Design an enzyme around this catalytic site. Structure first.
Site, short mmCIF file in Angstrom:
data_model
loop_
_atom_site.label_atom_id
_atom_site.label_comp_id
_atom_site.label_asym_id
_atom_site.label_seq_id
_atom_site.Cartn_x
_atom_site.Cartn_y
_atom_site.Cartn_z
N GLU A 1 -7.29 -6.67 11.70
CA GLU A 1 -8.32 -7.64 11.32
C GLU A 1 -8.18 -7.89 9.80
O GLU A 1 -7.82 -6.98 9.04
CB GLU A 1 -9.69 -7.08 11.61
N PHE A 2 -8.41 -9.14 9.38
CA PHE A 2 -8.19 -9.52 8.00
C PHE A 2 -9.46 -9.36 7.22
O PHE A 2 -10.51 -9.86 7.62
CB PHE A 2 -7.75 -10.99 7.93
N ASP B 1 -10.53 -6.63 -1.96
CA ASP B 1 -10.82 -5.20 -2.20
C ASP B 1 -11.95 -4.97 -3.20
O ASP B 1 -12.22 -5.82 -4.06
CB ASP B 1 -9.56 -4.43 -2.59
N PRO C 1 -11.12 2.32 -4.75
CA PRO C 1 -11.60 0.94 -4.64
C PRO C 1 -10.58 -0.03 -4.06
O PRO C 1 -11.00 -0.93 -3.31
CB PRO C 1 -11.91 0.59 -6.10
N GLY D 1 0.82 -1.20 0.00
CA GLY D 1 0.00 0.00 0.00
C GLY D 1 0.86 1.25 0.00
O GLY D 1 1.93 1.28 -0.63
N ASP E 1 -7.03 9.22 0.67
CA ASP E 1 -6.70 8.27 -0.40
C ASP E 1 -7.79 7.27 -0.70
O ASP E 1 -7.51 6.06 -0.87
CB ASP E 1 -5.42 7.51 -0.05
O1 LIG Z 1 -7.23 -8.72 -2.49
C1 LIG Z 1 -7.20 -8.63 -1.17
C2 LIG Z 1 -7.25 -9.76 -0.36
C3 LIG Z 1 -7.22 -9.60 1.03
C4 LIG Z 1 -7.11 -8.31 1.58
N1 LIG Z 1 -7.08 -8.17 2.93
C5 LIG Z 1 -6.60 -7.10 3.61
N2 LIG Z 1 -5.72 -6.26 3.01
C6 LIG Z 1 -5.19 -5.18 3.63
O2 LIG Z 1 -4.29 -4.36 3.01
C7 LIG Z 1 -3.71 -4.76 1.77
C8 LIG Z 1 -3.32 -3.52 0.97
C9 LIG Z 1 -2.95 -3.94 -0.45
C10 LIG Z 1 -2.61 -2.75 -1.36
C11 LIG Z 1 -3.60 -1.59 -1.25
C12 LIG Z 1 -3.94 -1.24 0.21
C13 LIG Z 1 -4.44 -2.47 0.96
C14 LIG Z 1 -5.60 -4.93 5.02
N3 LIG Z 1 -5.28 -3.98 5.94
C15 LIG Z 1 -6.03 -4.36 7.05
N4 LIG Z 1 -6.81 -5.51 6.91
C16 LIG Z 1 -6.52 -5.86 5.60
N5 LIG Z 1 -7.01 -6.91 4.90
C17 LIG Z 1 -7.06 -7.20 0.76
C18 LIG Z 1 -7.11 -7.36 -0.61
#
Ligand SMILES: Oc1ccc(Nc2nc(OCC3CCCCC3)c3nc[nH]c3n2)cc1
Ligand SMILES: [Mg+2]
Lengths: 258, 296
Positions: B81-82, B86, B130, B14, B127
């Protein structure tokens, strides 16, 4: 943008309690005193001037120092290290372009190394548990300024000047919350310049009256009167600048008549 | 320190650092681990100092939850948290179905709650896109990547100019206004609303002037009538082509009347008149809002 002005003020009122340093901490410090802290704060004022930092950055740094020293014992030869790391943190949080770590090393006049400053940064973060978004006298004043009819640039600068002086002296200003010091400084500024008083609209907003402000006001009035004779003078010199409308050259009122 | 976490796979990169999917071996919790490599540099980055201090304050169902910060002398790890994917990847996957209106409405409603909560706690996200909006199997959507966020004051002063991914960037930023505020995040959300409907970016410019001209050809070139002060803005040019405003039923054709009305208030030129997140939650578009699970 008055859609959230109220939510934000309410929330800052909650957070200033939580972010308050411990009122009697200096008493519990073996090696450092109020006057040593005044010396440090005065130097940070200079640093802020030299690098053209926001006033908010200065206020945040002091908050971080007071909170750090509320639980961490510090020897006098290490107080400037604490202060330098706090200023570096405050700058990273608040500035568009913070000075680099090398510049912070340089202004301690090589008293400390880069490694020491970075290790202290990490220690300050641990001790504050990364909780750096603290309310300041500045954040409250800036809201109070919206209640002027009409706005007065000298009222604003003089209120800032007075809030800043409160940073220097832990006794007595550690016992007052940022919102209260700001109310006292705003009323003091307004009265000094225009003869006017703490507005009714700010009583509705804050719930503070002249009565509830009185304790802080009387301390701040005295600070204001004795400012030319205080051992620390960097805020007075800073506020001679045209940027702050030379407000430090204004004469304080003899009486408040409260 | 990281002993209880078993890395599963890298998710991506990110604003700063790297994010992995991991699981807590003792509790079973699946987490997102944001790794930050740190001395001799500039120490802890400003982006991390901001993300952490600000995310610790913002506990809300539509804001990614920061669970823990693990802080050695070499590495900093943020435990979140997961979330399962996106919005961008989800919209790509909805290629053929489109996104059902109830899910669009639910996502928008939830995003506005998240954002109203940020703005009421003096945080600008700066920022929204999507890629930073994350969804789970239960129908939730959450604001993520607060790497570009900051605490603001009332009233605002001047903040960093180089903000918001270009396609989602507000006209007041493009035109160089010395003050921008919460209304920049609403602009982004409005572009995202349109995008969820059409499944393509509303204003995909490839430079700042391109971005402005795309916005102008859609909403009309602003003058002093629509946006008092515009012609005084630093990067306004009297040479700008003067396009007529398009009727909104043409901007996002599948949208009904309440939808178009909300979108138009989110894409108002004058930041001062642009709708706030708080006020938008009561818009008639949301009268029948539910919370559909997606179609993963
Ligand atoms: O496709 C998927 C599968 C899974 C995820 N999962 C997820 N990802 C994060 O950041 C990942 C970044 C990636 C690059 C742009 C900003 C976000 C998180 N930050 C807290 N919890 C998060 N969970 C996301 C996308
Ligand atoms: Mg002592």
């Amino acid at each position: 943008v008055p859609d959230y002005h109220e939510d934000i003020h309410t929330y800052l009122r909650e957070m200033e309690v939580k972010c308050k340093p411990k009122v009697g901490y200096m008493k519990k410090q073996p090696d450092i005193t109020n006057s040593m802290r005044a010396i440090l704060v005065d130097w940070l004022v200079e640093v802020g001037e030299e690098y053209k930092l926001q006033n908010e950055t200065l206020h945040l740094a002091v908050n971080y120092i007071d909170r750090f020293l509320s639980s961490m014992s510090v020897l006098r030869g290490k107080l400037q290290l604490v202060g330098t790391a706090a200023m570096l943190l405050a700058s990273k949080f608040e500035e568009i372009y913070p000075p680099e770590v090398a510049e912070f090393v340089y202004i301690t006049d090589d008293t400390y190394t880069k490694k020491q400053v970075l290790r202290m940064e990490h220690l300050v973060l641990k001790v504050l548990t990364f909780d750096l978004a603290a309310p300041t006298v500045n954040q409250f004043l800036t809201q109070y300024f919206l209640h002027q009819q009409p706005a007065n640039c000298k009222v604003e600068s003089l209120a800032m000047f007075l809030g800043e002086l409160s940073l220097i002296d832990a006794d007595p200003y550690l016992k007052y919350l940022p919102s209260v010091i700001a109310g006292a400084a705003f009323h003091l500024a307004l009265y000094t310049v225009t003869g006017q008083s703490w507005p009714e609209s700010l009583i509705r907003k804050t719930g503070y009256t002249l009565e509830s402000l009185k304790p802080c006001l009387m301390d701040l009035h005295q600070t204001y009167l004795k400012a030319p004779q205080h051992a620390q003078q960097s805020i007075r010199e800073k506020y001679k600048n045209s940027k702050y409308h030379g407000v430090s050259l204004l004469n304080p009122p003899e009486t408040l008549n409260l | 320190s990281m002993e209880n976490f078993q890395k599963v796979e890298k998710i991506g990169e990110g604003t700063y650092g790297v994010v992995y999917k991991a699981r807590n071996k003792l509790t079973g919790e699946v987490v997102a681990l944001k790794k930050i490599r740190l001395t001799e540099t500039e120490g802890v980055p400003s982006t991390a100092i901001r993300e952490i201090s600000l995310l610790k304050e913002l506990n809300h169902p539509n804001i990614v939850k920061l669970l823990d910060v693990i802080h050695t002398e070499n590495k900093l790890y943020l435990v979140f948290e997961f979330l399962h994917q996106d919005l961008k990847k989800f919209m790509d996957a909805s290629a053929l179905t489109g996104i059902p209106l109830p899910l669009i409405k639910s996502y928008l409603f939830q995003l506005l709650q998240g954002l109203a909560f940020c703005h009421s706690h003096r945080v600008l996200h700066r920022d929204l896109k999507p890629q930073n909006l994350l969804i789970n199997t239960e129908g939730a959507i959450k604001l993520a990547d607060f790497g570009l966020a900051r605490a603001f004051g009332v009233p605002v002063r001047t903040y960093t100019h180089e903000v918001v991914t270009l396609w989602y960037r507000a006209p007041e930023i493009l035109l160089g206004c010395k003050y921008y505020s919460t209304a920049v995040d609403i602009w982004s959300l409005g572009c995202i609303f349109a995008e969820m409907v059409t499944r393509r970016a509303l204003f995909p410019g490839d430079s700042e002037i391109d971005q402005l001209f795309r916005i102008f050809r859609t909403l009309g070139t602003p003058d002093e009538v629509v946006w008092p002060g515009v012609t005084s803005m630093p990067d306004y040019k009297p040479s700008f082509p003067k396009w007529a405003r398009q009727d909104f039923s043409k901007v996002v054709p599948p949208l009904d009347e309440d939808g178009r009305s909300l979108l138009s208030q989110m894409l108002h030129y004058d930041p001062n008149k642009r709708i706030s997140a708080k006020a938008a939650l009561a818009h008639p578009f949301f009268q029948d809002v539910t919370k559909p699970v997606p179609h993963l």
